[PDB]
Amino acid sequence: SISMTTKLSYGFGAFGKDFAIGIVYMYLMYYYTDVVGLSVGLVGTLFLVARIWDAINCPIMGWIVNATRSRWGKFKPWILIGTLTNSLVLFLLFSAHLFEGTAQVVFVCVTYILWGMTYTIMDIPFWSLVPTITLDKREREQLVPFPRFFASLAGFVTAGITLPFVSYVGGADRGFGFQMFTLVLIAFFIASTIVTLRNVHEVYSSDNGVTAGRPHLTLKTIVGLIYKNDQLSCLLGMALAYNIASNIINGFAIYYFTYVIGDADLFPYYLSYAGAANLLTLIVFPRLVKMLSRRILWAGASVMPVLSCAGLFAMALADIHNAALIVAAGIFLNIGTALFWVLQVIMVADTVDYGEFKLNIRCESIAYSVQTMVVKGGSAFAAFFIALVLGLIGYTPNVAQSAQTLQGMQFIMIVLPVLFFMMTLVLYFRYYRLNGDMLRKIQIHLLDKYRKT
Numbered sequence: 001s002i003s004m005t006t007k008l009s010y011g012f013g014a015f016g017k018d019f020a021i022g023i024v025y026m027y028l029m030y031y032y033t034d035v036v037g038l039s040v041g042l043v044g045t046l047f048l049v050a051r052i053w054d055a056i057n058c059p060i061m062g063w064i065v066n067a068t069r070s071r072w073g074k075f076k077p078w079i080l081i082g083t084l085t086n087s088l089v090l091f092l093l094f095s096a097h098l099f100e101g102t103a104q105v106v107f108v109c110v111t112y113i114l115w116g117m118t119y120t121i122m123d124i125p126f127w128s129l130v131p132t133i134t135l136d137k138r139e140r141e142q143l144v145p146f147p148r149f150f151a152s153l154a155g156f157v158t159a160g161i162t163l164p165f166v167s168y169v170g171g172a173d174r175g176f177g178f179q180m181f182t183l184v185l186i187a188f189f190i191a192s193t194i195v196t197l198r199n200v201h202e203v204y205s206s207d208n209g210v211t212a213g214r215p216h217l218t219l220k221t222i223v224g225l226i227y228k229n230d231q232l233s234c235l236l237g238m239a240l241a242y243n244i245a246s247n248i249i250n251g252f253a254i255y256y257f258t259y260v261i262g263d264a265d266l267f268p269y270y271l272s273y274a275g276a277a278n279l280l281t282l283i284v285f286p287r288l289v290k291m292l293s294r295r296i297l298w299a300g301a302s303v304m305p306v307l308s309c310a311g312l313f314a315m316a317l318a319d320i321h322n323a324a325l326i327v328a329a330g331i332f333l334n335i336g337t338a339l340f341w342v343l344q345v346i347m348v349a350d351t352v353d354y355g356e357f358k359l360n361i362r363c364e365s366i367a368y369s370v371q372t373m374v375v376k377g378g379s380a381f382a383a384f385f386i387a388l389v390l391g392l393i394g395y396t397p398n399v400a401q402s403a404q405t406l407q408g409m410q411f412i413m414i415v416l417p418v419l420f421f422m423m424t425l426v427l428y429f430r431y432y433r434l435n436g437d438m439l440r441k442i443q444i445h446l447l448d449k450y451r452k453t
């Protein structure tokens with residue numbers, strides 16, 4: 001039994017954790033372009049460089065978390081530090097409207113990077129608590145839905161309430177409203193950190209005496225344990241492919257809603273229905289993973305978005321008008337993404353257990369470093385592939401193109417995510433082994449091996 005209290009406290013921790021970044025991810029473009037007034041090229045270059053640099057930084061944070069011998073634990077201290085420092089840096093991030101000229105181009109450039117690193121400090125260790133809470137298949141299956149559901153809910157309520165709050169509190173001074181809302185986020189986020197730190201207790205931590213973890217390891221060694229843990233490498237590839245495809249699809253949606261108005265008030269309906277789908281499929285995930293195989297659910301996680309892509313491909317070939325097609329594609333995609341995230345967290349935990357099984361080392365921090373690194377690098381790589389595709393199609397001037405050229409660009413933008421999803425499902429079914437009796441073997445081997453000295 002995982003104490004219902006620990007489940008709920010981890011859920012609220014995840015809520016506060018993703019409620020502090022959803023605003024950034026979603027409206028930092030709007031803030032920096034519509035409020036601060038910075039060139040879109042500057043913002044894009046900064047975002048891409050920062051994602052690459054944060055992805056490079058992630059394994060560094062994993063090494064840091066692994067080598068930290070502390071009282072609270074090897075995770076909670078960095079969780080607290082990252083939470084507080086990232087709260088401060090988020091407030092500073094959205095306080096950019098105050099400065100002007102180079103002074104703010106530096107400010108914006110200095111805060112943003114600091115916002116990305118700081119979050120890493122708390123992001124890697126937080127999820128590293130999943131493997132230490134339990135080692136059982138079904139207990140993980142019923143543990144992770146709580147945090148994933150709460151994170152998704154944070155994202156959607158952010159989308160719903162952030163603009164109303166800014167308009168009501170600040171009005172003309174939209175930047176003041178943004179930073180006041182940041183304060184709301186900080187309150188929820190710090191309270192969530194306190195809750196998770198107090199009520200979540202580590203059982204199978206690498207800082208316990210019976211575990212096989214070695215604190216005094218090098219950065220070369222740790223990053224090599226990604227390659228040695230073939231299952232973690234397979235997870236890296238799969239998650240990178242899934243993230244690249246999901247980022248391409250989300251960019252398509254951003255263009256087809258922001259630039260192409262489509263129909264008025266289609267985006268609110270789409271967002272509401274898609275959030276319902278996401279949160280519901282997260283709520284029923286234990287029942288589904290009992291009824292259907294975990295493998296079936298991963299296959300579905302990749303396939304359902306592919307069905308969305310195919311449907312809206314058909315819409316591209318025909319008239320791009322059906323709102324039902326759009327909202328149904330969103331529903332399918334959100335079901336898939338929820339399944340993916342739940343299964344991915346469980347799979348990172350399974351990979352740390354398999355690392356102890358094979359290499360005789362327990363490193364949670366590195367597996368979740370791979371998770372976050374892949375989140376950043378998927379966006380970066382999706383940008384790279386999109387730029388390659390657009391340059392190949394002849395959009396590299398970005399001045400004016402044939403309508404047929406634009407439609408073919410849409411077609412390719414649709415097919416590419418499908419290729420990446422096929423990559424992830426193919427790689428999962430060809431190389432991944434931690435799903436069945438192997439999971440039980442690793443669990444029993446670890447429990448039996450957990451005998452002092």
Ligand SMILES: O=[N+]([O-])c1ccc(O[C@H]2O[C@H](CO)[C@H](O)[C@H](O)[C@H]2O)cc1
Pocket residue numbers: 017018025119123151250372375
């Ligand atoms: O498609 N998006 O815009 C998008 C949504 C959520 C997100 O956050 C996830 O990746 C983070 C990595 O820093 C944290 O692991 C966090 O816990 C995850 O929920 C990242 C991007």
